[PDB]
UniProtKB/Swiss-Prot annotation, chain A:
<feature type="topological domain" description="Cytoplasmic">
    <location>
        <begin position="388"/>
        <end position="398"/>
    </location>
</feature>
<feature type="binding site">
    <location>
        <position position="396"/>
    </location>
    <ligand>
        <name>Mg(2+) 6</name>
    </ligand>
</feature>
<dbReference type="InterPro" id="IPR006668">
    <property type="entry name" value="Mg_transptr_MgtE_intracell_dom"/>
</dbReference>
<feature type="binding site">
    <location>
        <position position="185"/>
    </location>
    <ligand>
        <name>ATP</name>
    </ligand>
</feature>
<feature type="transmembrane region" description="Helical">
    <location>
        <begin position="330"/>
        <end position="359"/>
    </location>
</feature>
<feature type="topological domain" description="Cytoplasmic">
    <location>
        <begin position="1"/>
        <end position="261"/>
    </location>
</feature>
<dbReference type="InterPro" id="IPR000644">
    <property type="entry name" value="CBS_dom"/>
</dbReference>
<keyword id="KW-0472">Membrane</keyword>
<keyword id="KW-0479">Metal-binding</keyword>
UniProtKB/Swiss-Prot annotation, chain B:
<keyword id="KW-0812">Transmembrane</keyword>
<keyword id="KW-0460">Magnesium</keyword>
<dbReference type="Pfam" id="PF01769">
    <property type="entry name" value="MgtE"/>
</dbReference>
<keyword id="KW-0677">Repeat</keyword>
<keyword id="KW-1133">Transmembrane helix</keyword>
<keyword id="KW-0129">CBS domain</keyword>
<feature type="binding site">
    <location>
        <position position="409"/>
    </location>
    <ligand>
        <name>Mg(2+) 7</name>
    </ligand>
</feature>
<feature type="binding site">
    <location>
        <position position="413"/>
    </location>
    <ligand>
        <name>Mg(2+) 7</name>
    </ligand>
</feature>
<feature type="domain" description="CBS 2">
    <location>
        <begin position="183"/>
        <end position="239"/>
    </location>
</feature>
């Protein structure tokens, strides 16, 4: 009936609203291949969960009908968690497969090796269209994709790439060398997870040839896997903006005690800094005593500082991740972003000055005013160079979180504001 | 030597060197490049740059380029001119051949960020009254003018959709077997009015490299590729990011946007926020009768306000993302309200013990509860605020990525004070 009608995705989507037991049985019941595709797009936590529960026959079932790059991710899940059971889990496989998966684990999850599958179709050099097809057909059953064929040499090293679209349009008796493409865009096995995703997206590829530390083709990567990178890349970037520093943190799958350990770290760095603010206020207590109104404006003043700093740091952290801007550009961003703050100040001061005034304090109006078009100015430039600097230091500009740029706009905002008051008090 | 040492060079190599090329060099290269490469270069540029070169480049190279360009891509570069110069748009569809300009008229009509927007009519389609032999025979004669022959879609006498074939299959199958034998009626499709982002959700789930597009009747009018849905994924996300930092412009390309442009982008939410924060000025002066008695009090206002503002930024992000990743149900808010409730108290305490430490050491033992106790009540509240704000903002029908960090702080001031200056109105009397 429907045991062949339902798609894995159907069961995936409703997984979010399915009882664990029911979910469990649907792993024993489905076809081998469908049972494997489901346990394939589950959270690494649930994966290692069902690999423990499911029976030893349905276990070896999944482990076989599962892709090799996918299998590694799943075993690596168990490895991290229950390591004892990991080695046992890895016992169910056969010699050739285990020694295949084993080689994948030794690659960094975040690099090419940790993203590639060995099931790629690669022919030797001097065959023909018609031969390559007969090969493809014979190799197809176990390949990940036969849509791109890689031409290696007698030492295993990439020498060309072949489109199945090409073989299909070509006289079968034409030698592939004269239709394959020699400039094989590729990545190494250390190549970064994100470094791949760019290439994939850049050249419009759907498959990418990973060569080993020695140019020998050793696996391929598929875009559908890069999609998952991308999303997890951006998810990390966003998480790094709001100042949470767990790259692999899923909200629903994480408790209080764990949410504590994740957020508390940056709130203790930032408040140590934000303390400099109290001290800074005390230093200017003569000026805070004389004219009382000065403090009445610290919030709206200091805060419109951090908002400005956010926007520009935000606007720049991404141009860097999006490769829209490079480190060689700072000295130009400065100019542009500098005449942008000045303008952003003029605008926002003309607005606050009106409040200061209507507030009933027409005397410290220039103080407040001139203090904005000096805060909005530097707040800007700061957020607009903190990432640029972290790059030149070899650091993740995403660490230039919005909170960090805000806490740092306080230490500065006061120093600007108060220091400009104490100067105006002299007159 | 211009069409030689350069003849080889990849349009991508050329693209990477783009920002490093003058507004005059990018022109002569754009006018010299083999017609094919030139259009691949124009192809990925920004609507603003394209529409520049589709005007300044000579009428001939204009013709060449215009034509040797993917259909869905042509449609874009067209619309990119419709906005800037509605005039040139239709004097430029004159460089087109009645057939090419046909699919285009029908393509622009669709919304840029809808399914129909990113789709192309260069899909291969067939009838069930066929056999593997003929589909292959048919592919061969239809391939050079298609986007992809790896996926074949079968239609009926009227044009509706009926199933999908993977070329992989048409190569492991026997040439004599029927076509409706190996196809799939379980064919997942997408409406023409479907959302740019929702499309990229499917194609990401189903590990699809292609997706069909129907109208309100189930016909087949085009397809969408994952190469184009890849860029989308970036956009939607990299726009979500701008929407965190109170920048609110669609496809903002900083590298190409000048002062006025950026000014136009950032000013709107700066204003909104400043005269939202002004509420703290009047909050301060409706409380100067309390502030006057204790000097040592305002010394801490920043450390107290700009902490909960960070706290609110954290809870906010996680939830906002946990929403856009489809991770959190709109009906998980009661579960988050209860969850975060304890973390913000557990965060509050660990943080107070630190501030109280300084408040004391600082030289103001006068009374730490007035400060330390306020801190807990702010870190508690602000947290629960940045959490439920993206929640509420959804049920109303609004992009929860609008609960931008700046907004969360600005809003956490107007609340931070009220809490603090009340624990100093009570703890004082
Ligand atoms: Mg990384
Ligand atoms: Mg891996
Ligand atoms: Mg692309
Ligand atoms: Mg293309
Ligand atoms: Mg894969
Ligand atoms: Mg990053
Ligand atoms: Mg949208
Ligand atoms: Mg489009
Ligand atoms: Mg996927
Ligand atoms: Mg798969
Ligand atoms: Mg396309
Ligand atoms: Mg969005
Ligand atoms: Mg603040």
């Amino acid at each position: 009936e429907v045991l062949e009608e339902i798609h894995p995705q159907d069961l995936l989507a409703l997984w979010d609203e399915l009882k664990g037991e029911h979910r469990y049985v649907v792993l024993t019941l489905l076809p081998k291949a469908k049972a494997a595709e489901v346990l394939s797009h589950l959270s690494p936590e649930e994966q290692a969960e069902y690999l423990k529960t499911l029976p030893p026959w349905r276990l070896r079932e999944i482990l076989e009908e599962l892709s090799l790059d996918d299998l590694a991710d799943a075993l690596q899940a168990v490895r991290k968690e229950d390591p004892a059971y990991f080695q046992r889990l890895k016992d169910l496989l056969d010699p050739r497969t285990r020694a295949e998966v084993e080689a994948l684990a030794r690659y960094e999850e975040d690099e090419a090796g940790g993203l590639m599958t060995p099931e790629y179709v690669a022919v030797r050099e001097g065959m023909t269209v018609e031969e390559v097809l007969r090969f493809l057909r014979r190799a197809a059953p176990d390949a990940e994709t036969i849509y791109y064929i890689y031409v290696v040499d007698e030492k295993g090293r990439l020498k060309g790439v072949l489109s199945l679209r090409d073989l299909i349009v070509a006289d079968p008796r034409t030698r592939v060398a004269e239709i394959m493409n020699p400039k094989v865009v590729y990545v190494r096995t250390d190549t970064d997870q994100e470094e791949v995703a760019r290439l994939m997206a850049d050249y419009d590829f759907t498959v990418l040839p990973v060569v080993d530390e020695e140019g020998r083709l050793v696996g391929i990567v598929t875009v559908d896997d890069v999609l998952d990178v991308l999303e997890a890349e951006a998810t990390e970037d966003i998480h790094k903006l709001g100042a949470v520093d767990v790259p692999d943190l899923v909200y629903s799958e994480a408790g209080p005690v764990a949410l504590w350990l994740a957020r508390v770290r940056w709130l203790v760095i930032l408040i140590l800094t934000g303390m400099v603010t109290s001290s800074i206020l005390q230093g200017f207590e003569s000026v805070l005593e004389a004219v009382t109104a000065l403090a009445f404006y610290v919030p709206v003043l200091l805060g419109t500082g951090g908002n400005t700093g956010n926007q520009s740091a935000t606007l720049i952290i991404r141009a860097l991740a999006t490769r829209d801007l490079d480190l060689r550009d700072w000295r130009r961003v400065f100019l542009k972003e500098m005449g942008v703050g000045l303008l952003l100040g003029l605008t926002l001061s003309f607005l606050l000055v009106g409040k200061v005034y209507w507030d009933g304090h027409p005397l410290l109006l220039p103080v407040v005013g001139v203090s904005l078009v000096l805060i909005v100015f530097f707040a800007n430039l700061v957020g607009a160079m903190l990432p640029f600097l972290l790059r030149r230091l070899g650091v993740d500009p995403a660490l230039v979180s919005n909170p960090l740029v805000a806490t740092l706009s306080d230490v500065t905002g006061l120093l600007i504001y108060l220091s400009v008051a104490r100067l105006l008090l002299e007159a």
